[model samples]
Target chain A: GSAVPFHGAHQAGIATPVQDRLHFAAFDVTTEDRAAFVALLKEWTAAARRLTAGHAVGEGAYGGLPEAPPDDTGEALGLKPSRLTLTIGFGPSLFTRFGLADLRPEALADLPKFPGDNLDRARSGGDLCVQACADDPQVAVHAIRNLARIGFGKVVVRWSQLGFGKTSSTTPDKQTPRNLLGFKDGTRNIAGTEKDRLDRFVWAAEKDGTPWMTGGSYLVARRIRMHIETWDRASLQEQEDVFGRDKGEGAPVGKAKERDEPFLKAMKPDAHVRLAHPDSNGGATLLRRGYSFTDGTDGLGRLDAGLFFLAYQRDIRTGFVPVQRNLATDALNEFIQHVGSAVFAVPPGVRDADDWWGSTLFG
Target chain B: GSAVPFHGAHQAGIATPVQDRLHFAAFDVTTEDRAAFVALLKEWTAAARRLTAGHAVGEGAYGGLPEAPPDDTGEALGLKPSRLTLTIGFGPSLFTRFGLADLRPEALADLPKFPGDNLDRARSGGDLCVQACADDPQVAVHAIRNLARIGFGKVVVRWSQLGFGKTSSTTPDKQTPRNLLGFKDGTRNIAGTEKDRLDRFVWAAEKDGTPWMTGGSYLVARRIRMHIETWDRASLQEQEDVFGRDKGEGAPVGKAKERDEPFLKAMKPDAHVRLAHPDSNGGATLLRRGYSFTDGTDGLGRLDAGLFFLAYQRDIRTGFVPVQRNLATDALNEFIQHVGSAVFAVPPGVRDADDWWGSTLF
Candidate 1:
């Protein structure tokens, strides 16, 4: 099930490393070319096949309309979603390239693909998408280059998403992709908080759509780019004031707390100006579930930083969108910029036995 | 535990497509020089550690070991075998080495040493030995190159002793190192046979040795060079005649194969020398476990093929060495060459836990 309430109850539950940021690229190819697209997809997927050598690679489709409520729907009939999915794997090449072949006897090829409607539909004969991570900004770009070689109509590379526990944790793979200022970022995050439990994670609620989605949560997406090199030179005060959090631990400036909102009353007048402007707008309330990713290495060094923000809401119009519009002119804008953005329709829970098509759409 | 019985275990028990062919190397260094060695080893192991960068590179030992055996002759403590193990991960690189990065992930540093005889110690400050699949005759040389970078006094790399079921039957790294024939080799192996069962594996009768070695086995070693391209071009008949069996299945050919005589009545009168001359010297009574190694790729397209012949004999005087002398000019020798050979005294099983040193000493 894409949105299972239980965390990591599949495949022996291997430990999944959390990335500070991850980049994803999703494309939408229309339904007119459905047949032609299937043929093209078969051909393209086959092309990706030979390059992979012995790797087991395939494309699958989602079952039906994800927003069709909690009925058996497409799953009962085995009707796959209209979307197509193409997942490319980079085998041991990733480890061998960096001289880390000593860790495993057999190389790892299957990267973790977050289960959702977006992923399920991609399994069928539809459009293509790619997801990857890199220590250098360019590494993510390089991953995209390889993805393009397979077959993709369009792609959206986003950075960062709350990991398996839906917490802002780190993965062994992306251990230390540091930003500018020589500081390790992402110390404070609202993982499983009372606010998050009540507003975001549905299972923690009194009631939800399906019992399966009891412990399930949703995701929100935002694209906030940080001017890393410039932020590197900003003074600690300026950096702290911009994020409305501490420079190191990421705790609020006034309160010695981790998840509590920083007390604006205690800060100087200019402090809130550069960080949280109380009068114009109470600080942006977008649930931050983002990961850090690098675009690739330019001649100058890494050229990408910040989170590919994802927030889940019962209603996007009220939950995430408004908070983001408020962040449009915030003080952090000095060091961060928005390069790209998109809003995806995330599907709900899928508890099917044989049918792998549930939540294939909008997943 | 290194040489214990693990006859039929899955290859990748916990990990990926398959289980890793756990190859390990153990070395014994002096106690006084441990600090310097540990420091050097730390640098070397760090340089060799490979997990996240891309591939799982095994360049060092794990965190545990067994205790030492006692000396009965002098009524004193025996010299414990201190070890340094390394694993050389095999992966897609086996298919191709397209993008190898510079080894400058860190600087060159000295080797490290372990303190005392804490065989069960972790990576406190000990050296690591490199491991590989059958230590490709060619791959070993390259490992020697890397080991030189790390700097060590003594080194030994061994392919897992998998014949007894201690290793997974699957290709060590899922990449079958081809034999002279292009077909993927080692597809079929002997397991659960009359000889592979308790009747043969766990034994009491012996052609050699004292009660201490009653149930013990022989450790036979041989170095055979394969003529790959040449043998690859040979007709199937010649290949079958050379091995005296249907290679695809490793089955006997003759109609009525006797115990001492395997393919005698089964072979044709005009069979190749390896098969036809069954009564000749080292006729057909040795188990062969060999690995292919690419030594050097000549621009002219010339390739090398060979085998490292090893046989377990209850007694070398009667078992293996005698066969070597008889097969001085056997037919199989046409496509094979012997470069090195040695036979060691394989001690009985280790009784205590963590006592790998039981049979480690020379």
Candidate 2:
């Protein structure tokens, strides 16, 4: 139940059941040598394969090179694989840095600045990003730390966030989780097994985007800081109204079951569910895989608690843009501020033993 | 397996089986009204009792006053209690602000500045602290979040650390965990069942300090940042030498089994295990409950990974001070830096339903 295959048609993390923990890291490519950068990717691929299978990086931890730095960090030796998955993506900045401007996908441009976006430059953009998800937090942290270790000279960590309590589930068998606001999020998320829906809404089409991203997808990440101080003061009725669902049952305004069809007309004008629903945005939908984060206090006497929103889609222009435009006036906006944002073009997964992450793009 | 009792002579977190996750928060009291502060304590005590017993706070999530703000956050509604424990502590600054300096225990003084200390003021001092530990990270976070929610006007969160992978276990059933440096820590820690050790080294005696703190203990918290970039480059042999333990087995130098006697004479003169041993510090010992934390990157292209070291002792003057002084020249010091520090007088646990967290003193 804990082990996930490393090689597949698509990356495992996107449509895989959401793990309980996350360690998402964005990196800046520090090296100017193109050959060295590709070599680092190859090394990262091998290590990730080993780690996801519950094996040490190279020659095992203890018996490895006694004279050199141990191939693996060894902290995770006794731990299970915990269904670990490492998904990699290339940011728009990476294409520019590597003189591969012609290879940039049409859907991978920087997102348009939306209203109420208080984006911080330091945490916003990156050359690359890795999303590590696992049942055990130590497993996720170990995977990212080892990858970062292998990429020592080629890449530098730009900004990273450790997230607990996943906010969304990508499988029907799993229960929808609550966000920091105490409301069930992603009630109507697309299921992983629906290949037809995945093709229509999630996977990038070869004709619509670059060939290298044929089976890949686009990822948009936003670090949304919840005004928890204010939300905590709101009454239960107000909280339920803001979410357009029962606080206890997570049902729609006019429905009793969580998965029932939402009554758009019965919901308040600015209710979050009504505004972001697929029925309202010309059927625009995306696979959400967010997690809740509390990075201590903001030092201004407030807890820096919020949702690290992650979404995968076929095209951002038709996926995230239209849905976000509808929610620009969402009632929930008052309690949340978008503090960081990034968009990346995820490449297809490694097909076999000879294949590695981004092999098509690198070729 | 999921619930730890809230009312006892001592708090459950210190000696309870180590949890998988921790959310430790230090707060600053903002109110001057003594009555209101006492009222908050009473309210906090009731809520903590309910949360630790696997029940929702107040009238449960659904039955509570709908018009009023929820007494409990519903995020952990489906989660088990996971052996949750809420351990409270009173900082030195709290006594001065509330006009209770006369009641402050003599052993609750601020930690003396040690060599190689690069303490950050913002993360160091606080008026109070709450350590929430549980098997589930979300459960630990939920307990702290609700407490902070209840303390909105009276106290504000100064700083908090979300810890994954505990570094020390208080029970013999658990295997020692590794810190970010990739070496087992707290191999020789005091076990929870050692009653004699608890009385002799952990719990404060009535005659030793103020009467209010008779069964209570002093807590020392230090945030030590591990220079992972430098340590990752160090050779495995050098790393083992610095810790004076085998990387895999965590055995003492020149010893085979992990629980074998430490051959101190064979260890490097400045090895961490040698300098930090109780035998090397006049028989001084403390109960350790440390955790590993990584708060993103430090913006200069490095991960802010470290050990949030916590130790409860009968008296810091005799416990942490001597051991730290001996380690002022430790070989491991070069790869680690103490960036934040705080000391708190953890009052005895609530004895019964009518008892609040600090009722004996308040």
Candidate 3:
């Protein structure tokens, strides 16, 4: 709907620029044949480095910001380049009981077995991982494709969570959450303390498995895409009851009792009942560290919200799985759908004096 | 702008229940004696919790949201009792490095003296970080004040960076390069390569210090803020020329000729250039892992944008300080200002056989 229609770009004008961002993660395995994987990775990264040549910034030189003074002449404010950071974590089940498992690091039997852009396809690789970034989504996708040609697995794709806020502050109030719906979430999950955390999630000596298991923890991953329109459609009262809080104030429904809210008490016994029921047996808790996202807009012209939930605990049975299962048909369920589900054995915590992926437990 | 001026509550017109949304971090220190600090923290947290118990959730749950769901059942949700979340961080310099240097935390005496709300305040025997949120920002501020009353450092405010887009999928059709100054930025940079990194940064050999020191890195923190208005008034040509790129395309300026661009080429024999100048001796190469932010928009109608720039390397003399010293009075200084800065030593990568914090380095 425009006043002037059909006039092409050169005549009409440049539209406001929108930004597209992506998130990437890489996993390096602890393997028996490091020489093999290292060789393969070298080749793979070498190819990637070549493909993205002239674009990538030196790792040391990224993240510097350019803030020019007002009195200056117009010049290219040398901005620090965007970057890709790589961090290693133990696979869910294996890492929990086996201490640190190592896999064989033989070069991939086949590199070009698959077709299509590697960015859209999540390449499940073993042993080594590499993550990179580009200003152009296609360039980033191409970088991944080139890596897949060299053999990498479990390659996930999504948007990167860039920083926003005052200098030093990570929160960008205007910036959307990384996942778990649009609500400025992460309020209820217990972080930083044991008392606030449920006992099952507490890493205890009772956790079964290898001797080194004490003090180790389990990893939980649950990917949920929220139905924003459905959530938005709920009447103010319904929203409060389901979430167990007032919509406008984000306060408990009752005024006198500020310290402790009876959430189960506020909701209609039938609404959000299964999820909100306070039974120690059915009730589950985990310290939440999740991200928010928007896959793209949908039916109502509103965007879909993404909440990738990750929690850690000594015991999965009591920590995360139950709450998810209970909430499968929860009132909240009507507004969100679980598109991806996975469980992994997180290896024991890594100590100092060890090499990268330094143990041979998998063999 | 509205008939009713907006206060925090009136604007949102919502109440959040009174509950202790406490956050705690745990540190795995090397001794039983460290328990004293832990005990003090617990007591301090408990006291803060008591004060917040009387607080109120002004609007309701999800007050921060723009709109609520549709189910029409008018029921008030009560708040839950206070519970604290404590987080912990293992300081590698304290636990791993064997009592090395003055900054090393080998003894209680090495701890930072309390400044304001930090744990060491004399009047407040408390030593834990605290933040509270009720229906009222005052309550949150009040709880923080209580913690400060005991000893915690008030609040260490964080800043943001400009120029860089907060993690975005930048399509030419989508986002063009824009710095805090609202212009194209970062057209020229060091090529990413192992050779470039190794050549640029000093790497520590296992034999350099302890065998454990191999593969370890450093933490460099620079708190930089931007002066937006000053930058806005600059001539568009002046903005593009110094940054080495076009204001619109973020590509090299002047017919996209590689030679026309700044960095090593753009400087004229005699010119008064600012940043990106050949003779300025500023813009030394250092890895930048900066995050941008806009803390809060105060009533003044002005905003803050900048970078909490972090760089890691094996050596200080060869890494961050040199590049910074060069940029200290560079042409970029006109639009930017430095408020606070500090550096921490980050340790080496962790191997599977190791503890989370790497087996108490001390």
Candidate 4:
């Protein structure tokens, strides 16, 4: 019951339940050994399959050669699968290597810096990225740690993030989570049960140029740093006005319930909801599977914390780029800053147990 | 059923089931206005009582006037108690202020700098510490955030840690948790059911301490930074030998089960379990209530993570000092470093609703 199926028409993480904890890493492949790097992907694919199935990697943490390092890190041993899903994405830089330039999807172009962006170069880009989301933090950390270990000498972690809780849920039945600012998040998110919308908005089709990305989707990871101390100083009315939702019931402005349709005019002209509403952006909606994060203090008296916003869509150009551009003048920008951003072309999931990740293009 | 009783003979967090998440914050008392600080404490005490009972503080985030900042932040509005427990502790610096020097117990002396300590001053000490632990991270964070908000002018967070999981559990039947080292930790931890041992080792006795701290205990918070990258490179055999336990079963050296008594002689000279064992430290023991933490990454490629070690004891001198000194040469030291350290005199829990935190002293 805990394992989310590893093989699927689309990846398990995208439209699935947002796991409670996430350990996301962006790796910089350091080696020029093309064959070695390809083998690493195969090994990672095999490990992902085993990890999601609640089994250990090669020989596991024990019952193996004592002199050799355990393929499975000992941390996740005996732990339940916790519905772990490891979604791999090929970054823009990965195309520059292994003569895979011709195969790189055009939609995977690097994200442009937004108006309010203060991007950290080290945290922004990578040759590869893996989103390891699980109900258990240790389980997710273990999965990512092992992959990094196996990919050693070939790749090094450029930057990583540890998120304790999600800001959204795929299913409507689940209680919606709150962001650092303490408001209900993803209230109008596209539900996983909406298949037609998922196809129209989320999943990539074969006609989208890259045949390998047929059932896959594009992912945008933005580390939106929040000024919580500043936000907390605002009166309740201002806080609610910024999001155009009540702090308690999470109802839209002038609306009575959390699920009530937004009366765009009822909210402020620069209200986050009004500006980000699907109708405001030509019905371009993003399926957000974001997580909240608190790294530490900002070297000042404030918290260096915010939402690690993760969104999946059919295309970045149509989905994120436009919506973000529209939000440049949004009032919420005063309380938040985009400190890091990365975009990736997530390949379709393996349809068979024998199939591996990236096989459509790498095969 | 989820609520842990706020009113107790001693603090609830110590002998309670370790929560799934922790948001431990050390605050520096910045206010010289003793009266203002005391008022803030009373307000915090009131809010905490409400928070643990799954109620809102002072008109909450919405009902209050929109002009005034919500006494309660909106984050934890709809969340459950989740067995949330807020334990307050008075640090050494707090005693120095407000003419409370006479009340500072002999056992409340600051921890002696250990031989290998690489403390970051910003995170090493504080005027007070409040540990907000719950089954949910957001709940815990909300509690701390609100407390920090309410105590705005009086106290500032010196350093805070967000721990997603516990490194140890007080219940015996619960599965032992693993540290970042990927091995079972605190397998021999003092169980909550062991009242006799807790009384003898954990609870501060009236005869030994100042009367104000009679029912109270001392807390030690150490940020033990683990070098997982280096540790992962070692062979499984070497890894097990260092802990004097098997990787999978967590058997103590030659023992069969994890619960089996550890054989000190069978273990190496500097084995972690052996050196830190009560037998080696003249029967000194600590009620460990620590949590695992991963704070992003080190400037290097490794994780800036480890156990945010929290332990309660009858006396720091007898419990932690001697034991830690005995572990000066622990083999595990090679893989870990003590980066931040703080000691606080955690007073007894409130026995009645009318009572407040630090009512005995403040």
Candidate 5:
């Protein structure tokens, strides 16, 4: 019934209501011309603005110059805006080229390889990324596909994931969604409604070292593959014990309701919930916006299903790094493997008609 | 918003309103014990009934025997039924075991490899299959996952495809959906409300070979891969020429409205819509229930996206086979590859309390 505003103080996707579908793509910049790269970003910003407003890119999929290729793919014609949001990010590798190394935020460094990380290079780093999310799968797909089409010579798709069943909540009124693990994920996430919490935990302030990233946040992406075949063989008690929550209610050990305070001591020393809790990390929190994905099956006959985990924070050093370090001993690690990783510095939102993505750095 | 009845004269999924998500699984029966196999079917039936009606499997995800694993996976605890339907089918290999060969419908034979097929063995065949669909992806996935959990030792999953954005419609009221090719798919499908057309094109009769399949139908499954990278680079004219439909309106080449008659002669000599039209194959028509899928990147800077094409008919001899043969030269074929294939005999719907999925054959 509502749409996320494309022009805002902060990007819509980071704090927007978690959409049901995701088409997250990482791209490698192909052109050596810095001007060409900035041009592509500007074009992407304009297309995204129109797409989020439920309008076509230029003349739309139809009723255009029939001789030339359509600006937008026809797949999403006749569909609603679907609350689509296209969030852009620049990677560390992007700055290596384009003479933009000086603009790189210190907090945007590549994520350190954590324990249990078996990262695949092909799926890991990218020069740039676009997180297209919407309630409609076609809408999300259309947004990404068109963006890719426009970047034909400027960039190429390094890797992408189509996700269904979001695994997190970013709004207070929204019900906590579940991952393929069948547990309620992100039950204690920082909601968009909490301004104070956002200021303290999410937003990068003016004096936070990187001037261009004042209002921006850092994004860390991990492609975690769940070994369902092994996990399925375990007993329900074991599953609950490893997660440190009641399977049905998504409550912590010794708690009755989902929102009840976790009695941390009741949980096992190696339980996932106990290890990842904010209290255990000295109030370190990141806004989770992960999604579940199933890409056919592994050649060995097991489902290639897991969480495409996405988290945004003011700084990766204090947010994801310390939290992941603490989870190194969590029992749930037995049934999961991190196969891909990347970090990007998401810039501040486009303020108005004259604004463009990453304008603060490029202007 | 309405739930499909789990028990019916014919399985609900074939004619039910196409849902937004799919979790289709093919299983290989491991147990040689006929009793154990039959027991699993009965269990699956009861569970499907409860699940389609929006109820928990047994004691519910919570409040069950706390010591034991919960009866349900709990992910779909608060979800609506969302018109969930689970359709069961028996593959040829299932009959080869348990002395049920004679009951196998002749129409349920393995599909012959088509000209451009590059079938992968792991995903090509199965002993049985179950199609779970619902508006909610969690509900559909939960249904298949729970079924797999129960069939742990008895039946192992051979292959599964998780699908989204239905590519075909089974009812007239549904707005035609698009495939990965960005064209309206199954625009001329036989609607469920058109029972006369269904009987002519879908349901098997007593004289159609196997008597046990009198009310059943034959299903042909194909996993197709779309060459979107190449297709994206093609010009608008080339794209429209291949599909023989306007990119925006989805109308036939020379028509203005989507439902207008596809003037075959006006279409390109090798257009997809012309080659696959029923008239091109001697009036052969099948009910399509396809879904689009994107399985990440192909590891070479391309999307592994395509349609999981499913069709149900009275017999494959006159249905999918002939139609696909005519489409051997389709212009669209250059942009797609058939990667996997399978066929199954979908048994008649459970009619009453005593009826089970394969009761007549088992």
Candidate 6:
């Protein structure tokens, strides 16, 4: 029911508490004019400011001019803020067209194709992306709708996804959630209070060759489709061995509790946990903020469902790239396929009402 | 967090409080053996009974035999019941080969195509339907998944839908939810406590049809796709004129409050509220339990979103047919189209622990 401040050192959605639902959208730029793009950002920021506080965008949804369209769509009117947060990111493609080549961070390069990646061209790349999240699905959808409405001609929606469940959290108080595989995820996730880890692993520093990206983070999103029919047909023993955890307790192999420190040797060498563990990936870590999505059934009668993986780090070259490379021989990889992918360099958050998203670069 | 009893006088879902999410599925019968179909019903009932109580389906999802597969699937393990309710309905196709043509209910006939209905064949008819609802989306999905798994070769899913928002309310105390169009929906819906209204307009009786459906009701499901991109461009005046209600207050054309009796004559000649009102169609009413759905985009730069309309009543002929015929001239019809349709005759609920889902019929 309460609201989060829009202007902060870091974006509300990246380091803040994760919400219950997510509406992530990627857009392609259609206009070449820099001033029009800046204006669009300003308009979107102001609407985000009002909406995050549970207030309407402009004059009114009703009781205003009858001849004009409603500034606020009014679907979320009379509703609480539900801790809404809207975060923006600029993709690698943005630098090519926006005169932003000089401001591009080397750490934000496009991701390399992994061993099992079957990428779709349409949902793969975008110039910009927005992560709208809140406890209410309607609120998240309304925020994205209005922002897209404001940028009608300047940008077009390239792809979008709606996640009903949050698969990770920045708060340790929450009972750890399970992915579609029914296995506990993000057990070793970094918490919001871990300032030292955030500075070392999550936030980019000015000394790292990009002053504009200081205090910012790199975001990587992958749409990994789970072969549920194949997994469900496996034996109970096989399912446990693949995840290296007991289904009911979520405990590691040879361990009786979920939080027990996993012994790498105790698990199968090709198990998912053994390969993805930080110890195996040169101490590189990622703060995951992924979600579960189901886009109806496939043409072959199987569910087109999977985890929309979202993660943040100071550098993707160190964080997700190495970790995924280490999973080349993972047994769980057979039951999952990465179908979509994108990477973005998110700039520092707005410092005040006068500042806006990507202001550090576009200023 | 509480559980609704699986066994009841009438099906619990129809008369009980509606949940927050819906996972509805329609399935095609692949087996012709009546005995095998009956066994599938019994197996499904036992699993539903345990799942509704927040318990595992069989021995366990884990800690069972190492060579055999776990029965529960374990996705919803350690989760609350969240007031889950599973309701079953039989369609006209089930009677063709089961040697049960004599027992088929005439009221369960297929729905006639209305004007502007662009129905999809892959998603339309099915031999049976199941409505699984719960507060947790995962729990509802798990319920349907297990049921489908139990059927194995006996049935295959023809079509399914997942509704994120409940568009109607059977309890008057709760605030009415809005549809994708942003208008307060089900403002004049029948409450669960209104037994007299249920008897008069909702539930089917022995004298009205076959004895098997004495305490049951007829279910009509229609997928209505809203043209949201076009609607979003409309001015507030045009939007208000379409629904015959004020945008902010949700009041009638000139009324000061939402609950004030609407003067239909003051509304637009083809307004949706005026035509859908009972006064326009011989007092026909429906106990609506519809929901809002979004199945990604339409591949044409527009959202594929709208209301998954679900309603229950005594008979479809006098209830939905006549009322929808009145909507032939509705102005709101321009903004919406019916894309999928199905009708089913639900049977009475299980009497006790010894009973199963279709014991009253089979």
Off by over 4 Å in 1: A1-23, A33-220, A257-261, A268-285, A299-302, A354-363, B1-362
Give candidate 5's TM-score. 0.96
Choose the strongest candidate by lDDT.
Answer: 2
Tell me the native contact fraction for each prediction. 0.00, 0.63, 0.13, 0.59, 0.48, 0.44
Interface RMSD of each: 24.2, 3.4, 16.1, 3.0, 3.4, 3.1
Instruction: Write model 5 residue lDDT over A85-200, tens digit each, in one string.
Output: 99998899988897787878888866777889999999999988999999888888888878888888888889998887642222223677777777888888999889988888
Write the number of the candidate with greater TM-score, choosing between 1 and 6: 6
Instruction: Assess candidate 5 and give its lDDT.
Output: 0.85
DockQ of each: 0.02, 0.56, 0.06, 0.57, 0.50, 0.51
Per-residue lDDT value at A286 in model 4:
89
Return the lDDT, model 4, position B243: 89
lDDT of 6 by residue, B1-362 (tens): 78888888788888788887888989889999999999999999999899888887888678888777788777776677888899999988888968999998877867777899999988887889989988877778778888888898999888888887788889877777878788888777889999999999888888986888888899999999999878888889999999899888788999997778789999998999899888888899988999998876566655567899999999988788888889999989978999999989888888888989888889
Let me know the DockQ for model 6: 0.51
Q: Candidate 2: which stretches are off by over 4 Å? A: A166-173, B63-66
Q: Where is model 3 more than 4 Å wrong at Cα?
A: A1-87, A92-184, A195-207, A211-214, A252-263, A270-283, A298-302, A353-363, B1-362
Per-residue lDDT tens digits of candidate 6, residues A33-97?
A: 98899989989888999989988787756788887888887878777898899999999999987
Alpha-carbon shift of residue B316 in model 3 (angstroms):
49
Residue B289 CA error for candidate 5 (Å)?
0.8
Q: Per-residue lDDT for B1-362 in model 1, tens only?
A: 01112111111111111111222222233323434544544443343322111111232221112121110111001111011123322111111221222211111111122112112122111222233222111122222223432443432222221110011122233332233332233323222233543223222244532443444334344445555445534555565566555433334565222112344556543333333232553432333334433222222223222333334334444444444554544556566555543343333333333232112211
How much does candidate 6 score in TM-score?
A: 0.97
Q: DockQ ranking from best to worst? A: 4, 2, 6, 5, 3, 1
lDDT-better candidate, 3 vs 6:
6
lDDT of 4 by residue, A256-305 (tens): 99999989999988999988888999999989888998876655657778
Tell me how far the alpha carbon of residue A300 in candidate 1 is from the true structure, in angstroms, after superposition: 4.1
Better of 1 and 3 by DockQ: 3
